[PDB]
Design a protein. Structure first.
Ligand code: OGG
Ligand code: PYB
Ligand code: PYB
Ligand code: PYB
Ligand code: PYB
Ligand code: PYB
Ligand code: PYB
Ligand code: PYB
Ligand code: PYB
Ligand code: PYB
Ligand code: PYB
Ligand code: PYB
Ligand code: PYB
Ligand code: IMT
Ligand code: IMT
Ligand code: IMT
Ligand code: IMT
Ligand code: CL
Ligand code: CL
Ligand code: CL
Ligand code: CL
Ligand code: MN
Ligand code: MN
Ligand code: MN
Ligand code: MN
Ligand code: MN
Ligand code: MN
Ligand code: MN
Ligand code: MN
Ligand code: MN
Ligand code: MN
Ligand code: MN
Ligand code: MN
Ligand code: MN
Ligand code: MN
Lengths: 98, 107, 98, 81, 101, 107, 88, 99
DNA sequence: ATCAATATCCACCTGCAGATTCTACCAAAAGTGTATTTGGAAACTGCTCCATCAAAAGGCATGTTCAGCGGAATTCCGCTGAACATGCCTTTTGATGGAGCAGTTTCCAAATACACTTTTGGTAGAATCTGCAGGTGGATATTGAT
DNA sequence: ATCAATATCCACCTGCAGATTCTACCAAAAGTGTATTTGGAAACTGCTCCATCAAAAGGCATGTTCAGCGGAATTCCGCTGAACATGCCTTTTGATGGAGCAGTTTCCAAATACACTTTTGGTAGAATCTGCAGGTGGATATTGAT
């Protein structure tokens, strides 16, 4: 009769992406844990690099621009190209809307 | 009424959550509005890239469920992902079949 | 009176284990080893089962990758047999000895 | 008897080598391997224990290990992060 | 005057490094290039210890970096003997500081 | 009315106040305890003392009165723990430790 | 626009055989194969391309046109090759 | 009747000489052009602080010297005293730069 | 080349651990409007230092000759690991108290941002000082031919 | 093992760049005191899931035989080190235009903390459903002896 504090994870969001890429494909529990680790890992690396970028340039704010440069610093060629395009597209749609 | 930032950006990944994680993680004093959206998009895209390749590996093995093994095959067989995860161990992933030619039986 | 020549079964084993993902060291012996080593740092410790498994996954992945490097060193010296000096060279270049 | 480190048997070490693509193994490899594994475990466990003590626990958790592996440049996926 | 221009001052650990140098080797000097190296060393270690302390606090869901986090970070970062001595100097400094106000 | 530097109170040469401030601007955490910067300044001061002790000795060994990068490198690389702490660090103008592999020698 | 900045080309050959010999000597090398020089040039080119790419990325992010010692130092740190002696 | 040192004697002398000093071993101007040429291919119209070029040179030489030490070890491992491309290739592969 | 012993494959089958589906619960979180605050772009511009042409010159790269001896191909044999069957003892598996990892609530020592007040670490300037780089040469090794 | 061609050691000597010395001034910073706020140590403790024990499971320790790998011994081609002549281009000492990095101040687009309110996202006890690991059968490829 306690509670068991909520332990967040990207599991549900990863699953949605899975269905968009392979509608008829499942994923085991262990595999999903691996994907959660992956998402957390990339988040930390990108955010950390963006953090250093802001600091190096004596800025108190982490903007889409730091995330972008961070992406170019961290991801390999083609991967960086697409990540940047996806990032820019998402911000546009977000800005260009309400 | 209110609309999730994710829906506005047209993403599956939680922009609101990413935003929250950015500050609590102590990355900077302030966080621009577009930062969490851009970041969520990058995370979603990378997620899609690996699941895409992992799904294919599963299909190639005549399976419908992606397991660790499939994530490893997808990553290690992809030059860029292999590089990105060059210092990561995927539990229960095994290794790629590979035997140095000089070890093979005599022609 | 069947008998496979030296190397045939070895080759067969390489193909088998490179296809599977199961842990190769037996659990109990590994767990005793882990507990013994930890005892030197802090007494009366307990381990979550997942902690020991994580330790075993990382240890085997490390040893498997080291064996690949070790094999490259043996082959460099025109041998097909790995020796201690091969493991030593590999670790030195990786900067684990260095 | 047979003390712990020896528990890591010859057949086990041979299986690891096989997965690593090794075809022939010198007799001296087995002891060399155990020594190497011991150093690896000592380094990782020492750090995992440090995280455990810092949290004032008596139980080493998977996360303690994951964090230890990560600062050692050996990130592990599948156990929490 | 005129339109002077206060070149923003750049801080360094130089004067403090100098003080420690004389304590250990009274008659030994240090070139500017070596001092730049020493300044890089102090900043590097500062960043590493602070970073380890930061993660450590986060892992335990704490929002405060205390001497206890610094101590654990020091043990995780420094090899054997250096850690032991650093911990003593650190502990001693804190215990002394808290007996002074 | 007697304002003593936190360093003096702590019996240190390194700047506690500066260290406290750097910890804040570095955004390492939301909050910083009072003993944190004292402990950290002590450790930085101790490590500096350790490397300067060894570098001064290297300088004396080479009959020099002024410590140069070469002396800092000689001190770090000849010392097991400092060498490990700085295992991935390059000291400019430090050169390397004299070391010729046995098999390369004559006769 | 200002004038002529002579086309830069084949500068990898500026890393001469004697220079490579010297580097190998500091590295404890006693004998060197004739093919080492080109192999070494290719390795240095990769090393420099990687570091310079990151350093320039820092430059552009700061909206500068001048690569600073700090841009290089930060780039080296990123790649796990921390350099002491040039700031930071 | 002329004097001549045996092959390897001067080489050993050079090792001792260079392991004792710290000066950069690559000509400065040629290195600077190399840096400018490579940078230019990435982005045109770039300027360089003189210390940025020196930082690149100190880092580049340290990287190559340490690589030659590893390479020498691989050659010695193969029972040779002469370093060859494959020694460099093995060293970089084990270091994880290549594979 | 010809059997003969084994391993390897593939199509098929089905038990079941683990993934999917349903239901009720609810605290943790995120969206938006309002008020208050400010980081940092914008515009003007001081001034550091980067690109560069200038010129003399010797440190050092280039290109060649010559042959010492290292790399590598070959032969070969002692021996050390691979393959294999035998009998057993260690590991695996499932059941079970209870040690602590945590969920919950309490409440004070301690972490600030702001206003003051002040000591000091930085710095622009020129002005005397000094450790040692580098040239010289004479005394002591190190080499290599005989 | 004596000898000569050379490199190496080295304490003495000194021009000079780099380091040290100060007068000067000063804006950026840090220290004690409220006054306001709260993170997280602390006490209590429910509920996992960890250590442990016994029975069922099945991998490994062990000695023999010998295939074939590793490395010693020998051979010699030709590559690479040493030495040397020639002269080029890097290095050094200087100066200048001015690109562009950076100091200073005006100011608004954008960011932040509640307070109020909504619907998710995570947890959990219950029943139901399935992808696929092994297990079997028969065919056939692989390996090895002759
Ligand atoms: N919602 C806000 O912006 C209020 O922040 C100010 C509270 O901090 C204490 C103080 N003296 O400033
Ligand atoms: C009335 N109201 C509605 C909001 N969303 C905010 C406020 C204030 O007041
Ligand atoms: C005073 N105030 C009122 C708001 N609604 C937000 C703030 C702040 O401050
Ligand atoms: C009005 N006020 C508020 C602060 N935090 C400081 C002061 C003084 O006075
Ligand atoms: C009057 N006052 C108000 C502050 N906040 C500080 C002081 C002093 O005095
Ligand atoms: C007198 N006083 C009033 C402050 N607020 C600070 C000081 C000091 O002194
Ligand atoms: C003397 N004093 C009074 C302050 N308000 C601060 C200081 C300092 O010193
Ligand atoms: C008078 N005073 C002196 C301080 N240091 C603070 C205050 C307030 O008031
Ligand atoms: C009101 N106040 C007075 C202080 N001296 C600090 C604060 C705050 O608020
Ligand atoms: C008083 N206040 C301060 C906030 N930032 C929000 C509110 C409301 O009301
Ligand atoms: C009245 N009020 C005060 C807040 N801070 C938010 C709201 C709403 O309503
Ligand atoms: C009415 N209201 C007042 C707030 N502060 C928020 C809301 C909503 O609704
Ligand atoms: C309707 N509403 C009123 C708020 N104050 C917040 C929300 C949401 O929805
Ligand atoms: C209605 N609403 C939705 C959001 N914020 C508000 C206020 O009111
Ligand atoms: C008064 N107020 C109402 C509101 N919605 N936010 C604020 C603030 O203040
Ligand atoms: C005198 N003092 C020194 C510090 N803070 C203060 C007040 O008053
Ligand atoms: C009024 N006051 C005086 C002081 N020294 N701090 C404060 C606050 O308030
Ligand atoms: Cl933004
Ligand atoms: Cl060996
Ligand atoms: Cl503290
Ligand atoms: Cl080669
Ligand atoms: Mn070009
Ligand atoms: Mn402002
Ligand atoms: Mn020429
Ligand atoms: Mn030979
Ligand atoms: Mn044997
Ligand atoms: Mn209890
Ligand atoms: Mn002063
Ligand atoms: Mn000298
Ligand atoms: Mn609280
Ligand atoms: Mn052989
Ligand atoms: Mn301009
Ligand atoms: Mn829901
Ligand atoms: Mn199957
Ligand atoms: Mn069958």
């Amino acid at each position: 009769k306690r509670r068991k504090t909520r332990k967040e994870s990207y599991a549900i969001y990863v699953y949605k992406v899975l269905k968009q890429v392979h509608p008829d494909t499942g994923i085991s529990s262990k595999a999903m844990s691996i994907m959660n680790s992956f998402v957390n890992d990339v988040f930390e690396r990108i955010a950390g690099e963006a953090s250093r970028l802001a600091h190096y340039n004596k800025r108190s704010t982490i903007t889409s621009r730091e995330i972008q440069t961070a992406v170019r610093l961290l991801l390999p060629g083609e991967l960086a190209k697409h990540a940047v395009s996806e990032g820019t597209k998402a911000v546009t749609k977000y800005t260009s809307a309400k | 009424k209110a609309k999730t930032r994710s829906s506005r950006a047209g993403l599956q990944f939680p922009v609101g959550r990413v935003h929250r994680l950015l500050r609590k993680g102590n990355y900077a004093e302030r966080v621009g509005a577009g930062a969490p959206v851009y970041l969520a998009a990058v995370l979603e895209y990378l997620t899609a890239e690996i699941l895409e390749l992992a799904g294919n590996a599963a299909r190639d093995n005549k399976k419908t469920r992606i397991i660790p093994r499939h994530l490893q095959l997808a990553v290690r067989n992809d030059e860029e992902l292999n590089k990105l995860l060059g210092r990561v161990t995927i539990a229960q992933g095994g290794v790629l079949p590979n035997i140095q030619s000089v070890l093979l039986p005599k022609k | 009176p069947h008998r496979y020549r030296p190397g045939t079964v070895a080759l067969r084993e390489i193909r088998r284990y490179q296809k599977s993902t199961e842990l190769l060291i037996r659990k109990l012996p590994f767990q005793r080893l882990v507990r013994e080593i930890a005892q030197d740092f802090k007494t009366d410790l307990r381990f979550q089962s997942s902690a020991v498994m994580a330790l075993q996954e990382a240890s085997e992945a490390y040893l498997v990758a080291l064996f690949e490097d070790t094999n490259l060193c043996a082959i460099h010296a025109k041998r097909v047999t790995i020796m201690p000096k091969d493991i030593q060279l590999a670790r030195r270049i990786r900067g684990e000895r260095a | 008897l047979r003390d712990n480190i020896q528990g890591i048997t010859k057949p086990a070490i041979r299986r690891l080598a096989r997965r690593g693509g090794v075809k022939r193994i010198s007799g001296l490899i087995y002891e060399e391997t155990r020594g190497v594994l011991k150093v690896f475990l000592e380094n990782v466990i020492r750090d995992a224990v440090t995280y455990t003590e810092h949290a004032k626990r008596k139980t080493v958790t998977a996360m303690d290990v994951v964090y230890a592996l990560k600062r050692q440049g050996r990130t592990l996926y599948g156990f929490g992060g």
